Every structure is written in structure tokens, then in C-alpha cells.
Design a protein around this ligand. Structure first.
Ligand code: MUH
Length: 255
């Protein structure tokens, strides 16, 4: 029901019940969100469909995967000895973008509940933008905090847990988290302290920021501002944090 248009350049969701409360909901929601360069921009609703500025680069998940140059075009990759058309600084920027937008939202008592690369858009100038396309409609178990899984507790602290997973997806260049692990295998091991592993191409400092996000105690996780700031510090240094160069035994995090 989504269609491109010049309503400026944008995207509209055509809606003709339950869908009426969601539609009356989503708009009410987007109105309250305000405007920030790291969250979607709604141009308006009309009666004749909800429209927001269009994102020419799609969702971040797909973007990260097309970035897998060794798969998309090996001649170029090998020749240039690189694993992705995206650099560490660009990856960290997408991460800083989401943390920035999320900080603008959390400050407004807005709980996202479904942060994930799939729900992020890559728009004009490659500015990551927080969005929400919707959830059979099973729950996003791989991205949920332990407390969301067991008691349906949703907060900025649980949005941070999902964020940490998203950061992992970023570094992984879009790999599925808990690759080859059962959704139920998680309800078990997660409470036992199990966590995603440090991606091979990842500097310990990024991994540390990821661990902070998934701490069992909801109140011990960093705020979205402490994340923006720490990421900003990494973007600021000369040091490279996400290895993207190619090497003999190189391999991509699974999908
Ligand atoms: C067409 C359309 C209408 C409305 C929203 N809304 C959200 O996200 C949203 C809802 C509630 C809360 C938030 C949050 F706070 F997170 F910001 C965001 C997204 C899309 N866009 C859309 N929907 C489905 C498939 C593709 C696209 C799409 C493609 C390209 N560019 C822009 N949009």
C-alpha cells in the first residue's frame, strides 16, 4: 500500500476496522514525534494515506548487506582488498545517527519497542533515520531485552538492549544475530548470561559498548546520550574501529 510520490519527493502509505485504529494511532504518534534529522519526516495525512519523506537508499539492513562487496562484486573487492563499500567511519556514523535520533526520542518519553537495522532508513546524504514498519507477526525475539521477553516490560533501557543488537548488526554488516541458534535456545541461554560474540572485525571498544547495552540489570545500561558521545569519540579519533580490509581467511558473519 506504500507508493512513491511528489506529495517534495516522498513515500505514501495508502490505507482504505483494526487498521483504522492503527492508522489513527500511527499518525497521532508521528505528529507527537516532532522533527529531527535522524527520525522519519512525515509530510502529512490526507483524505481522498500517510506520507513521509522518501528514503532513496532503503532500510539499513539491506544497505549493510549490499555493502558486502566480496559477494556483490569480488573483482572489485579483491582488487581493492576491501570487504565492504562502507568504511568504519561510515558504519560508526550510521550508529551515531541512530543513537542521536533515539536520544531525541527517549527524551520525549518515547519508547520504540522495535529498534533494529530493518527498521532504520538510509536517506538523503546517507543520514540514518529511525522508523517503524511494523511487526503471524511473531515477536522480534533476537532483539528483545530479557525483561521484554519474560514480562513484556518495554522502556528506554530495553530500547538500548535492542540498540546494542543493532550496533552488532552494523559492525557485522547486517549479519543475523545468534546465527544458527534457535529462538527458544535464547530464552534459555540469555538468562544464563549468554551474549553475542565479539565480531572478528571489531575493536574491543565497540564490543564493550555493545556489552553495556545488554546488561541484565536494566538500570545499568548506558543512556542513548552516553552512546552518542562514546561513538562520537571513536569517529573523532584517527584509529580505525571496524576492520573492513580483506585478508586470506576472511569471512562474513552469517545471514
Ligand atoms: C509510508 C510510511 C508511513 C509511516 C511510517 N511510519 C514509521 O516508520 C513510524 C511509525 C511509528 C513510530 C515511528 C518512530 F518513532 F520510530 F519514528 C515511525 C513509515 C512509512 N514508510 C515505509 N513503510 C513501509 C515500507 C517502506 C517505507 C518507506 C520506504 C522508503 N522511504 C520511506 N518509507
Amino acid at each position: 500500500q506504500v507508493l512513491k510520490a511528489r506529495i517534495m519527493d516522498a513515500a505514501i502509505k495508502r490505507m482504505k476496522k483494526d487498521d483504522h485504529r492503527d492508522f489513527a494511532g500511527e499518525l497521532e504518534v508521528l505528529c507527537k514525534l516532532g522533527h529531527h534529522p535522524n527520525i522519519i519526516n512525515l509530510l502529512g495525512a490526507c483524505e481522498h494515506y500517510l506520507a513521509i519523506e522518501y528514503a532513496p537508499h532503503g532500510n539499513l539492513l539491506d544497505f549493510l548487506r549490499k555493502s558486502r562487496v566480496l559477494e556483490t562484486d569480488p573483482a572489485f573487492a579483491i582488487a581493492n582488498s576491501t570487504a565492504s563499500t562502507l568504511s568504519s567511519q561510515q558504519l560508526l556514523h550510521f550508529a551515531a545517527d541512530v543513537a542521536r535520533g533515539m536520544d531525541y526520542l527517549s527524551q520525549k518519553q518515547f519508547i520504540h519497542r522495535d529498534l533494529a537495522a530493518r527498521n532504520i532508513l538510509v536517506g538523503e546524504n546517507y543520514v540514518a533515520k529511525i522508523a517503524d514498519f511494523g511487526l503471524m507477526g511473531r515477536l522480534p525475539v533476537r532483539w528483545m531485552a530479557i525483561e521484554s521477553l519474560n514480562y513484556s516490560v518495554y522502556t528506554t533501557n530495553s530500547d538500548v538492549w535492542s540498540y546494542g543488537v543493532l550496533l552488532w548488526e552494523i559492525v557485522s554488516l547486517g549479519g543475523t544475530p545468534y546465527c544458527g541458534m534457535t529462538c527458544a535456545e535464547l530464552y534459555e541461554k540469555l538468562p544464563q548470561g549468554y551474549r553475542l560474540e565479539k565480531p572478528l572485525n571489531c575493536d574491543d571498544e565497540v564490543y564493550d559498548l555493545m556489552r553495556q547495552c545488554w546488561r541484565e540489570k536494566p538500570y545499568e545500561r548506558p543512556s542513548f546520550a552516553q552512546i552518542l558521545v562514546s561513538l562520537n569519540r571513536m569517529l573523532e579519533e584517527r584509529k580505525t574501529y571496524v576492520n573492513t580490509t580483506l585478508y586470506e581467511k576472511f569471512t562474513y558473519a552469517g545471514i
